[PDB]
Design a binder for this molecule. Structure first.
Ligand SMILES: Cc1cc2nc3c(=O)[nH]c(=O)nc-3n(C[C@H](O)[C@H](O)[C@H](O)COP(=O)(O)OP(=O)(O)OC[C@H]3O[C@@H](n4cnc5c(N)ncnc54)[C@H](O)[C@@H]3O)c2cc1C
Ligand SMILES: Cc1cc2nc3c(=O)[nH]c(=O)nc-3n(C[C@H](O)[C@H](O)[C@H](O)COP(=O)(O)O)c2cc1C
Ligand SMILES: CC(C)=CCC/C(C)=C/CC/C(C)=C/Cc1c(C)[nH]c2ccccc2c1=O
Ligand code: FES
Ligand code: FES
Ligand SMILES: [Ca+2]
Lengths: 412, 446, 408, 198, 204, 251
């Protein structure tokens, strides 16, 4: 009996109990299974049903379609590349040397070109799950340590942080690098400021930026976006820049990447970003429930479209990125993932309705700007969001000052 | 005509039938000392003392000249005191009908009486405490005046009584009270109401204004925001319709009028309805044999801004016109935070409940969650119709930045104005207490 | 070689040109003129200052003296003044201390009003009446193990227009002291010999000033009494040297003379016709005696008064005759005392322990309405805090509590 | 005129003096407590940089370049003294001309206006101008743009710090340490312009 | 007495408390060689400037005291820069513009104004030496971690074999960028104020 | 007293400080120039395949074995001048002695080229063993400068050294890796048609290839810069004519 079991060991953790130091863990475990059972002490004697637990669990569930399609796509890409490169005894030797491959084959899968969706998803899982487990455990350690030392209750949000961080990295990232990235993102960007609801930066993107600038050779280039040993192949944004729509060819299969391929998600890249359709399906829910800001999403879209069309109109004879239209910007890279799930973090965005529009417009402008006129990087969503996080409070200030003037004029 | 678009009409069950009926016999009444903000009492009575209706019980130290008087004739039986000897209640046991008497006038002299005479008559009878001052919601000082007197002739609180039903029984008294206020004020009197008709005063400086929309439309704070913005320099007074009827009766017959009409309603009330009671009536005796079995909470006022009426506080408040009863919710459910709630209310669309329009909920006193930090998913903007930045203001209140809160507009607010923000907070903050603390700091420092 | 000459010449020319430009711009952009100060009534007693002088120093030079606790600058903020014109802005150095108060009438500390503007000043009347006097010591005798009573004769037969509970300031020059010169009576020699305190010495090479309250009330014309305690090194920290002014006063004797300044106004009793309670301990007898005598004999009021004193031991009592006489002839006054740490020769059977606990247990715990009384207190900090906490738990508001601090 | 637009944009963003070269950090960190004081200090820095860089360009091009004064003579070793003297003279002239006399506006800054001399941003800007060999108009535009960028960075930091009234920082980090970490995090965001060759 | 030269190290650290000298600390802490040379240069300049300013403290005209102090400081730093170019060319090429910026380094002017203007020359010299040591403490501590974790070497000596040359360590690329200095200094301040609580700032 | 004393104090202080500063600055120019020259001479000797430790040895061997010369790019024959001190970088700035390239000519993205450049001849007595050609071009983050030593046949490389670059240490900074600079030994700059033939290959060059060199791993944007600089400076607008002359004489 879980209920009475939890209610019997409760006394060991209250002040003076033999396990007082583990009160944070006890509370976190107990309120996950059962509700607090508390009443209202004053003020409004009736409260809304919503709470931070549900707010975070909905976002955590919204990315499951993207995660599953990402696993399937990663497996399919890896198998296609392996069969493009090797064959026969050479392929058998390659399989025997990688634990991902021979585990996939041990569990009933097949690494041949006629593999099914089950085998492809299993191969994708043997890449995704280790990263996610490492991130979860390492970040939870730091969160619980801070809560214990400061004698607080563990707030919610890490479920979202960990899964997003695991979904925005290449399938080949080393586990020690993943651990370092999550450590940085959690400790430096979130916990030092007091924890959930008290930071100003996006933790997952902060960790990703740490990795990006510390170990650039493992999170960029041709060697990291497809989990096939010895395979080297560029991706869509890198191909468009060298350049034009005629350079989009999937070398592993010899076909030409189409807008539908990019929209559905049959392209290499970060694990969860590929499927714009799945991302839209997931984001529509949380937007309907009112947990995500349609104002921020609209601002991002407006900025992207405006700047893309300006570049298209003015044109260039050297830079091929001037040709890319808005509907290609939408489906290439990590634009949709960031726009839907990372640009809508309530704590990092603006706190005013009119400031949210400016925040989104700035993010959208910066993403396209970095994509086009910055030759160092092919994509700019993470940098753009991190940049707009710095100026969101300034938009809030600009709006509130006008409000204060209205008040002083005795009309507000 | 002003239309409020942002707000919330709480769909709680047990809505009263708007028909008046007699109430159960009341044998004890009391004055609650903690509901008058900034009051430091000076006792003029002692346990066992006999009192007459309208006789002074205590006088405020910090507001010289303000008298709090007995609603009924009887004798003092209890003077409850709490931590640090704070006064909680002065309880009087009803007996006899002796009373203090004052002057009376004809209906056509009230509009031209003298302001100082009006002030003296109001103060002596203890009816001067029906007024409150925005900012700080204190009883006005005797020597002060105001350009704006706001009358609240509408009620939008959940399970509240309909003012027109009550007023139609006391048209002459209501009009006489309006006439008295027209002379008591140095500016205009604002009568805030709904679209329906009410008795009218013929004085030029008394004017009616119509408000429409969900709950927050019926608050004196909203009315002030829209008709006469308040600040440190500009101060407005507020009074509700039943107190206006009391004022009219006072100046028409020379006797303090202490009758009330309150709504007794809630999910656990067997037959919700309007009930005739007396000021400061004992709620324990009032709700006797009116509620279903089980553990319940009795509240004086709305479930949004009432006061838990237990122990020495089990009496009707001075500024409250309803009594609410609902179950104490203490159940613990497996994975309750994750279930699809067909029977769960929320201002968001995360539960199945919002799909069943017209549904009414048997709400309880559970806090649907634990205390947490504030994550602004934008619920406050949906319930605050005033021209402010609710998220910034609430974070200023949480941080204790009184100076910034004043700029953001804290002086315009009362604890009743943040009830919905407290209602819809995912972090389970309670913003009325924080606002009161900030106002206390601001008032003390200057 | 040529490069050296060119470098020298150009260095000199550049530096000189910059200096000359700065000087020329200064000569035209700085007012370089006179500046004055004046009371808001513009009396003939105007004040002329240099554009670089502090307001407090200028006023002191003009004869308008103000209280001080640090010899200059802001330490406590008692030196506050009102300004109408000239002082067009308030700096954070006045918001820091004393904080807020939101004086719409333009108040500031006098330690940081500066400088360039014709100043309009407003001051209280008490600051206009400051005077300096030279007095002759009538007596200087011990009344406790570390306390003396200094009696002064006012010159020219005049009487200072002070109010009961006020204080004056003593001024003495640089001096050196040694404790072996004190004539400690045999009634108190035991504890001095116990710690061999006669070995200590102290000195100061600048003039000193200190404030003291007087145990008399304005109906005792022509004489001022001060209860003075000698500042010895803390018993737990013998390292530090003793005090200066108290040692000098103890060194003085009958027939000597010393120079004092006029009184300053604060700590006056309220006129609300309410019961008054006085709590004192140790050296805080002067304000209490002043208030009691002024209320009972000069104002001839029938208000109810009570005095509670926390004494160390019966060996430390004084003014017992005065208080007993007052309590025996007046039906509206009573006084009680308790011993903090009695010793066998006291033969004590009365109240013991701390005075706050004694008062709580005997009078207030069963009192009808504690908040309606007025409380005047003075004593050591660890009595003052206990009394304040006790009164707080009874619900007494701050406006009914008056606390006087000698400086900890 | 596109040349000067490019120069101004480069100075404001691609070469932000505070968050790309990291100069003036002492006042950048100390005075960013409130947005209004930060804005005032940024305005002062803008004015000083704009008046300083061109004058130093003039002096350097007239007397300090090799052969500028006399053939075969190089007085470039006087660069530091000349630069700092000009800057100090200009700021001391400002203090007497505007702030303490009009409107006045001195009281807002107080201690912090006199020490603009030691503000490393201005000296570094003049040094970079000399290293880059700008013309007079380019010097004016570069000074103005760099000052504006510095103001932008400090105002953004002040806004963040004001937003942090709701934070719960460890006692050992409260104040200086947390501000250092916040600036470090701002640098990451400003690294978005690294590869731009404007 | 010794305390005057040791207090600035931890009790009154320039960068961690005052706060002064942040720019050079951020800039020149990617190699211990440059950090050490800058520490020595600042020590020398501050000590000599304090000595000379104190030597003539009674004759400085109040109008142009800033001009006089900056002239002395600039002369000293010009001499230092010439000497570095003459004898330490390889390190001078790496210090670039930050040798000249010693003039506007806040520590030198702050000490010259606050202390040297009211003290005897020898005490002023000792104060300058102590402040230089306090500055060098932070400089060297930050440079240690930055250089080690960013390139696997100390003072140019290989300590962690790099993978690019057959080793086992992969250097951190962020340690060679600015943000790492900010983070290092912040955490150093955290540790110092943990071990010396009296320096903790009030809540607000 | 005020004004006179102020002026006197400022004048005296300026005199003393200026004396010290000017004496120190003028007394060290020779050593500063010597250090600056040694920095370059060490790198030139390194690329030439001559070892030297210490300033004395560097100077001795540089004087004994290296002979700077000036070359006119337009015609490719030697021209008289002070090659030991000619400053090509500054010479490129001024329009009086520098041309501005066109879109199709500026393959290396250098924006200009000086009329005459300096080359260093390596000598083993009276004969000439090889020629060192300074080249430069734009990378991803910075401008990259290098020396390339060409043998007497005018076709075969014997060494390559990048002595100034600002790429990322792990990705683009590998141009300075000894293992990568060692690949250039033996490659031939031109083909049998005498056209530029150096190839930077993404994914590695074929074993035994005499024109291909492995590109930097994950640094295509810098491999492109290297390819552009080489295919430019080997063309008609660079050392093309000079190497053509070398192939059959002149040297
Ligand atoms: C309004 C007012 C009224 C007053 N009324 C009276 C009164 O009626 N009677 C009365 O007796 N006093 C009264 N005082 C107190 C009086 O003003 C003096 O403070 C007191 O007499 C001691 O003065 P002193 O010069 O002997 O000692 P001080 O020199 O002021 O202090 C000496 C003491 O401090 C210690 N000390 C010195 N330096 C240090 C250090 N660095 N660290 C630690 N300890 C140190 C010494 O060891 C010694 O204990 C009053 C004060 C005020 C403000
Ligand atoms: C939320 C998010 C943000 C990203 N931000 C960046 C970025 O700032 N810079 C970058 O180079 N890649 C970034 N990426 C990775 C690219 O979107 C993409 O996965 C990868 O570069 C594949 O190569 P391609 O863009 O050339 O197709 C991001 C990915 C995600 C999901
Ligand atoms: C998980 C467990 C059984 C015990 C906690 C112990 C532990 C090692 C936690 C690490 C992860 C973590 C700190 C999550 C926070 C958080 C909780 C606890 N419950 C949540 C519940 C719902 C939605 C979000 C959250 C959430 O975001
Ligand atoms: S003299 Fe010290 S506070 Fe006034
Ligand atoms: S060292 Fe202080 S501003 Fe640079
Ligand atoms: Ca060239």
């Amino acid at each position: 009996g879980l209920k009475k079991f939890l209610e019997d060991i409760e006394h060991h953790f209250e002040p003076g109990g033999k396990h007082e130091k583990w009160f944070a863990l006890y509370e976190a475990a107990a309120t996950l299974f059962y509700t607090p059972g508390l009443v209202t002490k004053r003020s409004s004697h009736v409260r809304d049903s919503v709470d931070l637990k549900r707010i975070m669990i909905m976002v955590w569930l919204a990315v499951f379609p993207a995660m599953f399609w990402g696993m399937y796509n990663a497996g399919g890409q890896a198998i296609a590349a392996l069969n493009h490169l090797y064959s026969g005894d050479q392929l058998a030797a390659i399989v025997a040397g990688n634990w991902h491959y021979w585990l996939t084959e041990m569990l009933g899968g097949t690494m041949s070109s006629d593999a099914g969706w089950g085998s492809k998803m299993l191969l994708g899982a043997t890449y995704f799950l280790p990263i996610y487990a490492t991130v979860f455990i390492v970040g939870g350690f730091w969160e619980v340590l801070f809560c214990m030392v400061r004698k607080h209750e563990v707030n919610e949000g890490f479920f979202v942080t960990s899964i997003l961080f695991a979904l925005i990295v290449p399938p080949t990232l080393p586990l020690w690098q993943a651990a370092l990235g999550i450590t940085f993102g959690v400790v430096v960007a979130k916990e030092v400021f007091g924890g959930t609801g008290r930071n100003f930066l996006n933790p997952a993107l902060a960790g990703r930026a740490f990795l990006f600038f510390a170990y650039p050779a493992q999170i960029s280039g041709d060697l990291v976006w497809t989990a096939a040993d010895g395979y080297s192949g560029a991706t869509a944004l890198s191909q468009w820049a060298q350049g034009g729509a005629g350079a989009l060819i999937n070398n592993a299969t010899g076909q030409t990447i189409t807008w539908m391929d990019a929209f559905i998600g049959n392209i290499p890249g970060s694990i969860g970003e590929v499927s714009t359709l799945a991302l839209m399906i997931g984001a529509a829910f949380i937007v309907y429930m009112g947990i995500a800001s349609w104002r921020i999403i609209g601002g991002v879209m407006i900025g992207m479209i405006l700047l893309s069309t300006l570049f298209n109109v003015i044109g260039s004879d050297t830079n091929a990125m001037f040709n890319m239209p808005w509907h290609w910007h939408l489906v290439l890279g990590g634009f949709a993932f960031g726009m839907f799930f990372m640009a809508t973090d309530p704590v990092s965005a603006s706190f005013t309705n009119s400031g949210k529009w400016a925040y989104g417009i700035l993010i959208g402008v910066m993403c396209v700007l970095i994509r086009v006129v910055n030759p160092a990087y092919p994509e700019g969503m993470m940098l753009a969001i991190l940049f707009a996080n710095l100026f969101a409070p300034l938009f809030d200030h600009v709006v509130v000052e006008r409000n204060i003037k209205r008040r002083l004029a005795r009309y507000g | 005509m002003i239309t409020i678009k942002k707000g919330l009409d709480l769909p709680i069950a047990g809505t009263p039938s708007q028909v008046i009926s007699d109430g159960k016999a009341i044998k004890k009444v009391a004055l609650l000392g903690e509901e008058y903000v900034g009051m430091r009492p000076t006792m003029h009575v002692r346990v066992g003392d006999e009192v007459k209706k309208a006789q002074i019980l205590f006088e405020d130290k910090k507001n010289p000249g303000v008298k709090f008087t007995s609603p009924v004739s009887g004798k003092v039986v209890e003077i409850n005191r709490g931590a640090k000897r704070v006064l909680q209640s002065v309880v009087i046991e009803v007996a006899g009908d002796d009373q203090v008497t004052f002057d009376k006038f004809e209906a056509n002299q009230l509009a031209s009486l003298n302001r100082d005479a009006i002030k003296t008559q109001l103060v002596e009878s203890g009816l001067w405490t029906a007024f409150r001052t925005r900012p700080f919601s204190k009883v006005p000082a005797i020597d002060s005046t105001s350009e704006a007197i706001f009358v609240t002739a509408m009620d939008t609180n959940p399970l509240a009584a309909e003012p027109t039903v009550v007023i139609n029984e006391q048209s002459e008294a209501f009009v006489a009270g309006l006439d008295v206020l027209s002379a008591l004020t140095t500016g205009k009197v604002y009568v805030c109401k709904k679209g329906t008709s009410l008795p009218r005063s013929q004085q030029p400086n008394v004017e009616e204004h119509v408000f429409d929309g969900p709950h927050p439309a019926g608050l004196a704070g909203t009315h002030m925001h829209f008709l006469y913005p308040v600040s440190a320099d500009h101060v407005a007074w507020s009074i509700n319709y039943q107190d206006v009827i009391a004022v009219g009766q006072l100046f028409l017959t020379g006797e303090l009028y202490t009758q009330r009409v309150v709504s007794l309603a809630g999910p656990v009330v067997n037959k919700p309805r309007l009930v005739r009671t007396v000021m400061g009536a004992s709620l324990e005796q009032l709700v006797d044999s009116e509620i279903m079995p089980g553990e319940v909470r009795i509240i004086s006022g709305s479930v949004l801004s009432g006061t838990k009426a237990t122990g020495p506080h089990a009496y009707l408040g001075r500024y409250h016109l309803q009594v609410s009863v609902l179950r104490e919710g203490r159940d613990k459910e497996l994975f309750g935070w994750a279930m699809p709630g067909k029977n769960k209310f929320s201002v968001t669309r995360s539960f199945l409940g919002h799909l069943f329009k017209g549904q009414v909920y048997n709400m309880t006193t559970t806090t649907n969650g634990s205390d947490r930090s504030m994550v602004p998913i934008g619920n406050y903007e949906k319930v605050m119709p005033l021209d402010m930045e609710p998220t910034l203001l609430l974070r200023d209140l949480c941080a204790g930045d009184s100076d910034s809160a004043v700029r953001l507009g804290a002086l315009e607010l009362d604890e009743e104005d943040l009830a919905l923000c407290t209602f819809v907070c995912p972090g389970k903050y309670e913003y009325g207490q924080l606002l009161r603390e900030c106002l206390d700091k601001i008032e003390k420092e200057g | 070689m040529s490069t050296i000459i060119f470098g020298v010449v150009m260095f000199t020319l550049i530096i000189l040109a910059l200096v000359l430009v700065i000087l020329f711009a200064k000569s035209k952009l700085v007012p370089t003129g006179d500046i004055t100060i004046s009371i808001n009534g513009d009396p003939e007693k105007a004040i002329v200052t240099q554009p670089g002088g502090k307001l407090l120093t200028a006023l002191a030079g003009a004869g308008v003296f103000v209280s001080s606790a640090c010899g200059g600058g802001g330490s406590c903020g008692q030196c506050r003044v009102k300004i109408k014109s000239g002082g067009g802005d308030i700096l954070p150095t006045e918001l820091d201390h004393i904080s807020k108060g939101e004086a719409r009438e333009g108040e500031r500390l006098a330690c940081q009003v500066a400088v360039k503007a014709d100043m309009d000043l407003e001051l209280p009347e008490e600051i206009f009446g400051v005077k300096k006097w030279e007095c002759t010591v009538i007596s200087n005798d011990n009344k406790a193990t570390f306390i003396k009573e200094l009696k002064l004769a006012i010159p020219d037969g005049e009487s200072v227009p002070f109010r009961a509970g006020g204080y004056i300031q003593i001024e003495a020059p640089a001096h050196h002291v040694k404790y072996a010169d004190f004539d400690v009576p045999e009634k108190y020699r035991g504890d001095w010999d116990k710690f061999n305190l006669f070995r200590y010495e102290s000195k100061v090479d600048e003039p000193i000033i200190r404030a003291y309250s007087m145990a008399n009330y304005p109906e005792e014309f022509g004489i001022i009494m001060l209860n003075v305690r000698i500042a010895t090194p803390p018993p737990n920290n013998p390292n530090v040297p003793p005090g200066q002014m108290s040692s000098y006063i103890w060194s003085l004797k009958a027939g000597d003379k010393c120079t004092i300044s006029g009184p300053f106004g604060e700590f006056f009793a309220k006129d609300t016709d309410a019961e008054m309670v006085f709590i004192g301990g140790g050296a805080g007898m002067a304000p209490m005696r002043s208030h009691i005598f002024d209320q009972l004999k000069r104002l001839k009021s029938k208000r109810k008064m009570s005095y509670w004193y926390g004494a160390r031991s019966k060996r430390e009592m004084f003014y017992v005759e005065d208080f007993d006489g007052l309590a025996a002839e007046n039906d509206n006054f009573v006084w009680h005392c308790a011993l903090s740490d009695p010793q066998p020769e006291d033969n004590w059977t009365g109240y013991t322990g701390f005075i706050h606990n004694v008062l709580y247990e005997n009078y207030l715990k069963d009192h009808e309405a504690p908040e309606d009384c007025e409380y005047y207190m003075c004593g050591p900090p660890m009595m003052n805090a206990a009394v304040i906490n006790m009164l707080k738990n009874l619900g007494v508001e701050e406006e009914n509590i008056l606390l006087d601090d000698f400086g900890g | 005129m596109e040349h000067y637009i490019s120069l101004l944009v480069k100075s404001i963003f691609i070469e932000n003096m505070a968050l790309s070269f990291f100069l003036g950090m002492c006042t950048f960190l100390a005075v960013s407590k409130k947005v209004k004081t930060s804005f005032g200090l940024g305005i002062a820095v803008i004015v000083v940089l704009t008046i300083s860089v061109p004058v130093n360009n003039l002096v350097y091009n007239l007397v300090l370049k090799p052969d500028a004064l006399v053939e075969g003579v190089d007085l470039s070793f006087l660069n530091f003294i000349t630069f700092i003297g000009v800057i100090a003279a200009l700021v001391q002239i400002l203090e007497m001309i505007l702030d303490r006399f009009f409107p006045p506006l001195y009281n807002a800054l107080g201690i912090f206006l006199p020490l603009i001399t030691v503000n490393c941003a201005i000296f570094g800007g003049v040094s970079f101008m000399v290293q880059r060999d700008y013309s007079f108009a380019e010097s004016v535009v570069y000074g103005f743009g760099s000052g504006v960028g510095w103001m932008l960075a400090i105002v953004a930091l002040a806004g963040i710090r004001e937003k942090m009234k709701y934070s719960d920082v460890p006692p050992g980090l409260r104040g200086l340490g947390i501000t250092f970490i916040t600036a470090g995090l701002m640098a990451l965001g400003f690294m978005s312009f690294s590869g731009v060759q404007l | 007495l010794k305390k005057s030269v040791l207090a600035p190290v931890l009790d009154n650290n320039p960068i961690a408390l005052q706060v002064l000298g942040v720019c050079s600390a951020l800039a020149v802490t990617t190699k211990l060689e440059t950090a050490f040379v800058m520490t020595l240069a600042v020590m020398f300049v501050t000590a000599l400037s304090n000595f000379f300013v104190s030597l003539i403290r009674n004759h400085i005209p109040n109008s142009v005291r800033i001009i006089v102090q900056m002239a002395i400081i600039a002369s000293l730093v010009i001499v230092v820069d010439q000497i570095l170019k003459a004898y330490l060319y390889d390190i001078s090429k790496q210090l670039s513009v930050f040798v000249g910026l010693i003039i506007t380094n806040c520590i030198v002017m702050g000490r010259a104004e606050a202390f040297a203007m009211k003290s005897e020359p020898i005490p002023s010299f000792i104060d300058g030496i102590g402040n230089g040591l306090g500055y060098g403490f932070v400089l060297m501590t930050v440079g240690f971690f930055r250089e080690l974790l960013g390139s696997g070497k100390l003072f140019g000596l290989e300590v962690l074999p790099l993978i690019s040359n057959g080793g086992w360590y992969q250097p951190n690329g962020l340690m060679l960028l600015a943000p790492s200095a900010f983070f290092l200094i912040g955490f150093m301040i955290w540790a110092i104020r943990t071990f010396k609580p009296e320096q903790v700032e009030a809540k607000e | 007293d005020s004004i006179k004393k102020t002026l006197f104090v400022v004048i005296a202080l300026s005199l003393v400080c200026s004396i010290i500063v000017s004496a120190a600055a003028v007394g060290l120019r020779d050593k500063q120039k010597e250090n600056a020259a040694l920095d370059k001479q060490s790198k030139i000797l390194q690329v030439a395949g001559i070892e030297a430790k210490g300033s004395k040895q560097i100077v001795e061997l540089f004087n004994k074995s290296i002979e700077p010369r000036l070359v006119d790019f337009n015609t490719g024959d030697f021209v008289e001048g002070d090659a030991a001190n000619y400053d090509q970088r500054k010479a490129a700035k001024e329009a009086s002695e520098s041309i501005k390239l066109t879109a199709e000519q500026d393959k290396a993205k250098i924006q200009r080229r000086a009329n005459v450049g300096v080359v260093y001849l390596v000598k083993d007595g009276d004969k000439t063993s090889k020629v060192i050609l300074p080249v430069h071009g734009n990378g991803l983050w910075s401008m990259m400068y290098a020396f390339v030593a060409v043998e007497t046949d005018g076709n075969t490389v014997s060494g390559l050294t990048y002595y100034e670059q600002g790429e990322t240490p792990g990705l683009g900074g590998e141009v300075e890796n000894p293992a990568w600079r060692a690949q250039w030994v033996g490659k031939k700059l031109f083909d049998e048609n005498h056209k530029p033939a150096i190839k930077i290959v993404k994914g590695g060059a074929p074993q035994g290839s005499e024109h291909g060199v492995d590109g930097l791993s994950g640094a295509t944007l810098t491999s492109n810069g290297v390819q552009n600089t080489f295919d430019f400076w080997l063309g008609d607008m660079g050392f093309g004519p000079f190497l053509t002359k070398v192939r059959d004489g002149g040297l």
